[PDB]
Write a protein that binds this ligand. Structure first.
Ligand SMILES: CCC1=C(C)/C(=C/C2=NC(=C\c3[nH]c(/C=C4\NC(=O)[C@H](C)[C@H]4CC)c(C)c3CCC(=O)O)/C(CCC(=O)O)=C2C)NC1=O
Ligand SMILES: CCC1=C(C)/C(=C/C2=NC(=C\c3[nH]c(/C=C4\NC(=O)[C@H](C)[C@H]4CC)c(C)c3CCC(=O)O)/C(CCC(=O)O)=C2C)NC1=O
Ligand SMILES: CCC1=C(C)/C(=C/C2=NC(=C\c3[nH]c(/C=C4\NC(=O)[C@H](C)[C@H]4CC)c(C)c3CCC(=O)O)/C(CCC(=O)O)=C2C)NC1=O
Ligand SMILES: CCC1=C(C)/C(=C/C2=NC(=C\c3[nH]c(/C=C4\NC(=O)[C@H](C)[C@H]4CC)c(C)c3CCC(=O)O)/C(CCC(=O)O)=C2C)NC1=O
Ligand SMILES: CCC1=C(C)/C(=C/C2=NC(=C\c3[nH]c(/C=C4\NC(=O)[C@H](C)[C@H]4CC)c(C)c3CCC(=O)O)/C(CCC(=O)O)=C2C)NC1=O
Ligand SMILES: CCC1=C(C)/C(=C/C2=NC(=C\c3[nH]c(/C=C4\NC(=O)[C@H](C)[C@H]4CC)c(C)c3CCC(=O)O)/C(CCC(=O)O)=C2C)NC1=O
Ligand SMILES: CCC1=C(C)/C(=C/C2=NC(=C\c3[nH]c(/C=C4\NC(=O)[C@H](C)[C@H]4CC)c(C)c3CCC(=O)O)/C(CCC(=O)O)=C2C)NC1=O
Ligand SMILES: CCC1=C(C)/C(=C/C2=NC(=C\c3[nH]c(/C=C4\NC(=O)[C@H](C)[C@H]4CC)c(C)c3CCC(=O)O)/C(CCC(=O)O)=C2C)NC1=O
Ligand SMILES: CCC1=C(C)/C(=C/C2=NC(=C\c3[nH]c(/C=C4\NC(=O)[C@H](C)[C@H]4CC)c(C)c3CCC(=O)O)/C(CCC(=O)O)=C2C)NC1=O
Ligand SMILES: CCC1=C(C)/C(=C/C2=NC(=C\c3[nH]c(/C=C4\NC(=O)[C@H](C)[C@H]4CC)c(C)c3CCC(=O)O)/C(CCC(=O)O)=C2C)NC1=O
Ligand SMILES: CCC1=C(C)/C(=C/C2=NC(=C\c3[nH]c(/C=C4\NC(=O)[C@H](C)[C@H]4CC)c(C)c3CCC(=O)O)/C(CCC(=O)O)=C2C)NC1=O
Ligand SMILES: CCC1=C(C)/C(=C/C2=NC(=C\c3[nH]c(/C=C4\NC(=O)[C@H](C)[C@H]4CC)c(C)c3CCC(=O)O)/C(CCC(=O)O)=C2C)NC1=O
Ligand SMILES: CCC1=C(C)/C(=C/C2=NC(=C\c3[nH]c(/C=C4\NC(=O)[C@H](C)[C@H]4CC)c(C)c3CCC(=O)O)/C(CCC(=O)O)=C2C)NC1=O
Lengths: 74, 49, 172, 162, 49, 274, 162, 172, 162, 172
């Protein structure tokens, strides 16, 4: 389950679980048609280390998806 | 046959790009005195083949 | 990641202080018992395969439903996943045992694990039991090894147990 | 937090592997080394008070101008925050000594150092000079492998700031 | 052509080399540029003619 | 002398050689000073096996330097066939994986990320594969995990220079050759001040990477096709980078892990500063 | 090739970093440990001949049927290739002892083991039983930390084969 | 990657042999001198920044063309690249010194380096010189450090020199 | 689960494409071949058990030490779990026959096989010999394309175990 | 990728023509012999492991140098690489045999292979021999299988041989 297992190999310090409403920031299907992503990837839970927290958020917003939540990972 | 082409004297003078030419009629450093007259026997004149 | 020293340091820092003479000597004692600790970690590493195997044989001896169709350790693919998880947990328990702190176990292995298994339909009570069996055999090995100097390893056997017991509790 | 113990465990884990003789040999180094490290730690710990006041002053003696009116070595609050900062460094040096690695320094002082110092107009030169001074005096509090350890970590901070 | 016409006269001792006997491959390599004048020579000297 | 035909005459093994000559072997017959042609700065010649020892000795004496020896017959079979990889087969991992859908992904990430070297079964990253199977991480996430692993560090980083590492990195992670000298430099400076790990992240969090692979697509070759903001000479670099289906990244070569893209070649695409 | 020295260097290099006190402490472990390791190595080296013949035989005594005709413990060539193979294992054990890590075992015997054994119809059980026997006899050639080292590596091979 | 032991092992294996009593004692001696070796590596680590800085100051003192426009250590970007390379080479020399073998230096730093610099237009003779200066200062530090026990480190100073000299030769 | 139908659909989907004449031709093969497949399936289905008892015994007859005490072909539970295991294989063979592909074998027996067999000390040789025997007897229950099908899948299992 | 039909089509197109009645019937014959072809491909698939194993046993029987230290099929890592390559080549030969065209073999396997082996120091003549042995055994199986209808498969046995012979020639 994206119910993070362990530290999810992030190492680092704290783990924040951040969910975003990703658009085709990521996951455009390789298909010929219009840069969609599966329907069930509307919200994308993801666990990142404290050191990598800021960079990721900057490139999420930059590519247009908007953060929906944020909780410390544990 | 290889020995002429692949030798110090041939290589030093004809490089890799010049074509070989008569040099017997001019003093070349290191030749013996008899190079000059001997060359005349070898050469028969421009028609001579 | 923390070890037993790093833990001391974090608590000291939260006071804004150099380590207390209290904490110093607690850590001097850990250094005092460290050869025993190395033998204890070595006991597990040197018998990892048998510890998993023996735990396994016994788990399925008790719970013959897991190896029937419908059961969570059937067919070969699922049994291999179950054997793999037994190894993963034994591995992080040995790491905690070298470290003198449970954090690597809790952070890299136990965190989220129960909810994973429930999502999967993996019976957590059976997984807890497999961990209890690994504990029995692992400690067996910590206590009765090849030509190690004779002495008392009960403190370390307890501590190893709590790591096995953390995992069990966290999962069941 | 980087220690010999965490490093070998990290390397095992990432290959899905039990600790083997390579990794346990490594750990023995860290444990064999603890005595010298911890002697350095105790000496730096009890002299902390004066090591800090010595280095603080030396920052003003080497950068005289810092102590006038309108400057960053003037008034109780600057001079207070300075002592504190050198004290933070010595604190993490002792932690790194006790821990068996640079982890405490890496996680609590090195990660982010330049960004912070740059936003707050803090010159590394001061901090290097604080540490160079601390290194001078620690020459006569310790010797042998405890001194080498103290030095290792002081120098590590100076390189982090250059 | 200068190199090729010249070479023949110079190395075949001015004997008439007729159209029917050119060494077809000596020159091919020399044109395509794989070989030098020096190895063009070494390939005429070991030819049948 | 250049690009050859045939191998042998009586019989031989032709080797083609390459050097850098002084005006001592080749000069013009001009009135002054001895010079060789500027474009035959490094010259190559194909010699059958017996004449070979004699030729190398001569060349070295009169001043030249041998740059290479390689059999002619190796070098006659062209450039790689690229049909398999002009346009590849994409592999993508779906939301509820099927049990062997996920099996497909792992085998491919391995092949692509590790550059076709064998990863033996003792070797595989099992705990990490566990994670992908349960969905805790995604295909891009997993791809980052392999790169920071020792196996990746060990076959590709520890034993070669940074120039080589970065060039491999582009091939593996991005599927394309490295476009500029600046790219090489920009990367080497990062590794030097933020370490190996930060530097690894820089290809996996890039905008270029994100567009093409998104997050559930295994990185696949894409440099044999025209891309954007790609210099034109980066399509010839790709041939130098990938040597055919049976070729691989291999650190076990007799000569070791070395380059493949000439440093001179990179500069042709532009030189600036920083 | 995995040794304590190569491991710490690998970890430094991959972070673009000079060796620091963490890494040098580790190295000291490997160097402090060399004496016990190398005593094990010398004892295993000179007894090699008999350790090999002892283990070879024990494979036949534990798997009697192997020595009957039509079987893989029959004829000079099988029995020859067996002695050789156990000799390879003892050789790499001594190398791992001398090297300060499992590298020699990992690179020359573990990488590829199962694929090879599976293609050639070689049962790991034999090899485990060869090694279990070698472990029994090495109990009285060594003691203390040399025995622990010998054991560490013998056990490492047995786990590689299970 | 090789170290001095690993090298022994590879040569032994190519004979099909257990290590020779010859090779054994050569390695026993390396263990004998290992405390000195650790001090020698520590001497470099503890003064890395100054070693690079001092080498640098002196390189540009000698070769004032590099810091003119047209020069390969001009403008700031290029100087930072040059300072970075000085550090990279000093780093792999220290690794070789801990290892007792040049291979990490040759394989992950020196291999291809000359051809890189020529492609870039970086004057290799100047780079060779910067390496010679690092050597002078580095060895200076190996020989005259903080309260190390007095003894003879010339064997190690030589070996460090050959690593500096390998790099120089490889690059010029 | 790999069948001709799932394979062509997978290939269409992955190119974002409707099924075309290429893919429907393929499907016709699978449907045209169902009759032979399903005849093999019915024959293997009704003549079933004895195949298991025959192969189980043959494992002990070929590895006599197996049926001796202290061994893994001794006692009711080992011999019971053996019959069961061969029965699992025949079951998945019939499934693969009926399904039109190796899917059932790949998903339920091949994925994980070696790890399991290695942890439990189960030699593939037994299983190969069980299957070689089953292959001998299936020579006279079937013929023509039903036999070829039965063979295809039995051989597929034997290669999975080598 | 080409098969025997696709090849016809490419040659026709280069003329700007619909397939010649010549080419049509050549392809009608391939369809005529296709059941035999399927049995031939099936013969290889069904005995792949033994074909590789038996080739292998015999290769090292002949060339006992490969399994000595210094030899290219020593230690386990290299033997596993060699066993794998045997499988890879047998695999692409079977693909060519289903296809009725060598192209997949030449394009995905043989292209560059010789130069790879030379770079690696892998003795190509030994690899060629391993391929010759696979051929002997593979064809053995194509010719003498389980209850296949009796007939003449020599045309297909030849064609399979040329694929084995292509690979051998390409590599040696
Ligand atoms: C797994 C296969 C799959 C499906 C089924 C799929 C659906 C899907 N439809 C989408 C958008 C859309 N779908 C529609 C469809 C409609 N608009 C209408 O008014 C009509 C009622 C209806 C057409 C009948 C529209 C207009 C959008 C764009 C919404 C927007 O961006 O504002 C998106 C967002 C990403 C994108 O715009 O590409 C997804 C993921 N994506 C997939 O990968
Ligand atoms: C889209 C643009 C963007 C923003 C705005 C952003 C915010 C942001 N701030 C963060 C951390 C942080 N932010 C702060 C900020 C503060 N601490 C204090 O005490 C003050 C009240 C305050 C400064 C005024 C601190 C201290 C952390 C680190 C928290 C930790 O790791 O413990 C993190 C976690 C990742 C990281 O540490 O890099 C994010 C994502 N990230 C982005 O990409
Ligand atoms: C083995 C060493 C060696 C010697 C000794 C030598 C002599 C020599 N002197 C020559 C010409 C010559 N030598 C002279 C010399 C003289 N003219 C005078 O009036 C003076 C009396 C005298 C100078 C003292 C002249 C003028 C020529 C050119 C004749 C011409 O081409 O008309 C030539 C014809 C080739 C040439 O012109 O280069 C030879 C071979 N060559 C050699 O290789
Ligand atoms: C390669 C990594 C490494 C290891 C493994 C290591 C082990 C090690 N264990 C030791 C002692 C010992 N080890 C034990 C362990 C035990 N006693 C028992 O009765 C229990 C069965 C077992 C519990 C774990 C005891 C009791 C001693 C003696 C007391 C002591 O030194 O603390 C010693 C001191 C020397 C000796 O007395 O033999 C070493 C060096 N040293 C190392 O560098
Ligand atoms: C410098 C310019 C130049 C000239 C003028 C020249 C003449 C010349 N004529 C030759 C032969 C010849 N020349 C002839 C000519 C004739 N036969 C007859 O019966 C007729 C009377 C006459 C034609 C009108 C014949 C037949 C030969 C060949 C003799 C033989 O090989 O038996 C040869 C011998 C080499 C060869 O055969 O190629 C030379 C050198 N060579 C030259 O390089
Ligand atoms: C096809 C017609 C042709 C050209 C153009 C040619 C260029 C050429 N210039 C050369 C050398 C040279 N060229 C120069 C030129 C210069 N040095 C400087 O500092 C200045 C910037 C520049 C003068 C403006 C120098 C100094 C060398 C000798 C390099 C050396 O040997 O160290 C060489 C090497 C062979 C030799 O030294 O004779 C060639 C082939 N060769 C040719 O055959
Ligand atoms: C961080 C270290 C780590 C852990 C601990 C981990 C657990 C874990 N166990 C899993 C599956 C599994 N785990 C088991 C385990 C069991 N089945 C039983 O019946 C027994 C009670 C038990 C063995 C004792 C089984 C059978 C599955 C497969 C479930 C399925 O796919 O149906 C999965 C799903 C991904 C996969 O199948 O690979 C994860 C993530 N993953 C990790 O990365
Ligand atoms: C494997 C470890 C490793 C090494 C050794 C390495 C060398 C290296 N040095 C480079 C550039 C450079 N190196 C220098 C160095 C110098 N300039 C001078 O004038 C001096 C003589 C000298 C300093 C002593 C300069 C100036 C550049 C930039 C060249 C340019 O872009 O114009 C580059 C191009 C990429 C970049 O600029 O980041 C590489 C790959 N890279 C590596 O990864
Ligand atoms: C460098 C490390 C290394 C190892 C460990 C190794 C194992 C190994 N054992 C082999 C064969 C063998 N191994 C044995 C083993 C035995 N026979 C018996 O009598 C006993 C049952 C048993 C010993 C316990 C036999 C009989 C063969 C011949 C197999 C064959 O070719 O049929 C082969 C096949 C090549 C050959 O025939 O030599 C390898 C590669 N090779 C290596 O390079
Ligand atoms: C944290 C990693 C680590 C280090 C750095 C370490 C150093 C170390 N250096 C030592 C000795 C020494 N070190 C040196 C070094 C030198 N002598 C000189 O005059 C030169 C200036 C310098 C040359 C490098 C000498 C001469 C000795 C005494 C002889 C010996 O023990 O070999 C000793 C033995 C105890 C002693 O005599 O002080 C240790 C433990 N041990 C460790 O675990
Ligand atoms: C769905 C497909 C599937 C397969 C194929 C399968 C094999 C399989 N065989 C097992 C055990 C076993 N397998 C055997 C096999 C045999 N004993 C003998 O008398 C013969 C030598 C041989 C039969 C040829 C034995 C004795 C055990 C018990 C092993 C143990 O627990 O010690 C186990 C361990 C769980 C258990 O004890 O039941 C699995 C998973 N499991 C599956 O789910
Ligand atoms: C496109 C399909 C494909 C082929 C054909 C292929 C061949 C191939 N064989 C390799 C190695 C190898 N190949 C062998 C093979 C042999 N050794 C011997 O002595 C025998 C003569 C022979 C077995 C018959 C060996 C031993 C190596 C390892 C060489 C080394 O690392 O030292 C490598 C280097 C990468 C690696 O080791 O995984 C490649 C790319 N790779 C491919 O992707
Ligand atoms: C599942 C994929 C598939 C396969 C494998 C397949 C095989 C297959 N092989 C056949 C015939 C045959 N197959 C062979 C093959 C051989 N004869 C020999 O003596 C050689 C040992 C061997 C050489 C390869 C022969 C001779 C025939 C009869 C003639 C013919 O139909 O062409 C037939 C026609 C029916 C029959 O006569 O039995 C089928 C359906 N059909 C399929 O759909």
């Amino acid at each position: 389950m994206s119910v993070l297992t362990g530290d999810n190999q992030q190492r680092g310090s704290k783990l924040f679980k951040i969910t975003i409403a990703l658009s085709p920031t990521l996951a455009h299907h390789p298909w010929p048609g219009l840069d969609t992503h599966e329907p069930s990837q509307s919200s994308y839970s993801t666990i990142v280390s404290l050191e990598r927290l800021l960079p990721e958020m900057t490139r999420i917003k930059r590519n247009g998806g908007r953060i929906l939540e944020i909780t410390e990972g544990e | 046959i290889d020995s002429y082409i692949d030798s110090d004297e041939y290589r030093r003078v004809f490089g890799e790009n010049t074509v070989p030419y008569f040099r017997g009629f001019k003093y070349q450093v290191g030749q013996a005195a008899r190079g000059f007259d001997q060359m005349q026997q070898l050469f028969a004149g421009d028609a001579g083949s | 990641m923390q070890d037993a020293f790093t833990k001391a340091i974090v608590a000291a820092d939260l006071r804004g202080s150099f380590l207390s003479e209290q904490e110093l000597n607690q850590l001097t004692n850990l250094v005092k018992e460290s050869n025993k600790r190395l033998d204890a970690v070595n006991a597990i590493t040197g018998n990892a395969a048998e510890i998993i195997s023996d735990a396994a044989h016994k788990l399925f001896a008790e719970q013959t439903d897991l190896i029937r169709p419908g059961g969570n350790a059937y067919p070969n693919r699922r049994m291999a996943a179950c054997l793999r998880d037994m190894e993963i947990i034994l591995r992080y328990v040995s790491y905690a045992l070298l470290a003198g702190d449970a954090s690597v176990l809790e952070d890299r292995c136990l965190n989220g694990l129960k909810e994973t298994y429930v999502a999967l339909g993996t019976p957590t009570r059976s997984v807890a039991r497999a961990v209890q069996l690994m504990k029995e055999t692992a400690i067996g090995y910590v206590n009765s090894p090849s030509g190690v100097t004779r002495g008392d390893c009960s403190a370390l056997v307890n501590e190893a147990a709590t790591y096995f017991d953390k995992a069990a509790a966290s999962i069941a | 937090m980087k220690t010999v113990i965490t490093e070998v465990i990290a390397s095992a884990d990432s290959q899905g592997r039990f600790l083997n003789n390579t990794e346990l040999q490594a750990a023995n180094g860290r444990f064999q080394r603890a005595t010298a490290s911890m002697e350095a730690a105790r000496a730096l710990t009890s002299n902390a008070d004066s090591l800090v006041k010595g280095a603080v002053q030396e920052v003003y003696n080497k950068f005289p101008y810092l102590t006038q009116p309108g400057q960053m070595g003037y008034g109780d609050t600057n001079q207070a925050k300075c002592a504190r900062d050198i004290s933070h460094y010595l604190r993490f040096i002792t932690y790194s000594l006790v821990a068996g690695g640079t982890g405490p320094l890496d996680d609590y002082i090195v990660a982010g150092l330049r960004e912070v110092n740059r936003t707050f107009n803090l010159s590394p030169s001061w901090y290097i000079e604080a540490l160079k001074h601390i290194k001078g005096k620690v020459g006569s509090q310790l010797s042998g492998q405890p001194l080498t350890e103290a030095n290792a970590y002081i120098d590590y901070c100076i390189n982090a700031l250059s | 052509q200068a190199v090729i016409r010249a070479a023949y006269k110079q190395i075949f001792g001015n004997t008439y080399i007729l159209e029917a006997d050119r060494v077809v491959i000596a020159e091919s390599l020399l044109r395509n540029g794989s070989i030098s004048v020096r190895e063009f020579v070494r390939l005429l000297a070991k030819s049948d003619l | 002398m250049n690009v050859l035909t045939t191998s042998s005459q009586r019989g031989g093994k032709l080797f083609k050689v390459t050097m850098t000559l002084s005006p001592a072997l080749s000069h013009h017959p001009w009135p002054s000073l001895d010079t060789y042609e500027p474009s035959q700065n490094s010259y190559s010649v194909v010699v059958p096996l017996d004449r070979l020892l004699a030729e190398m000795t001569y060349i070295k004496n009169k001043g030249g330097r041998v740059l290479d020896i390689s059999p002619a017959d190796l070098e006659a079979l062209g450039p790689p066939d690229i049909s398999s990889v002009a346009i590849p087969l994409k592999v993508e991992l779906w939301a509820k994986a099927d049990v062997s859908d996920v099996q497909a992904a792992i085998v491919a990430a391995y092949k692509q990320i590790f550059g076709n070297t064998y990863v033996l079964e003792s070797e595989r990253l099992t705990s990490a594969e566990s994670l992908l199977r349960n969905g805790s991480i995604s295909v891009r996430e997993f791809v980052r995990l392999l790169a920071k692993s020792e196996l990746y560090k060990e076959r590709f980083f520890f034993c070669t220079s940074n120039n080589r590492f970065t060039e491999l990195n582009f091939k593996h992670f991005l599927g394309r050759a490295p476009y500029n000298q600046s790219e090489i430099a920009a990367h080497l400076d990062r590794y030097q001040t933020f370490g190996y790990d930060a530097e690894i992240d820089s290809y996996i969090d890039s905008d270029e990477y994100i567009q093409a692979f998104g997050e559930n697509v295994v990185p696949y070759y894409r440099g044999f096709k025209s891309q954007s903001g790609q210099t034109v000479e980066s399509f010839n670099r790709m041939f130098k980078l990938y040597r055919g289906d049976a070729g691989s990244d291999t650190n076990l070569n007799l000569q070791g892990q070395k380059r493949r893209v000439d440093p001179k070649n990179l500069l042709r695409s532009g030189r600036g500063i920083v």
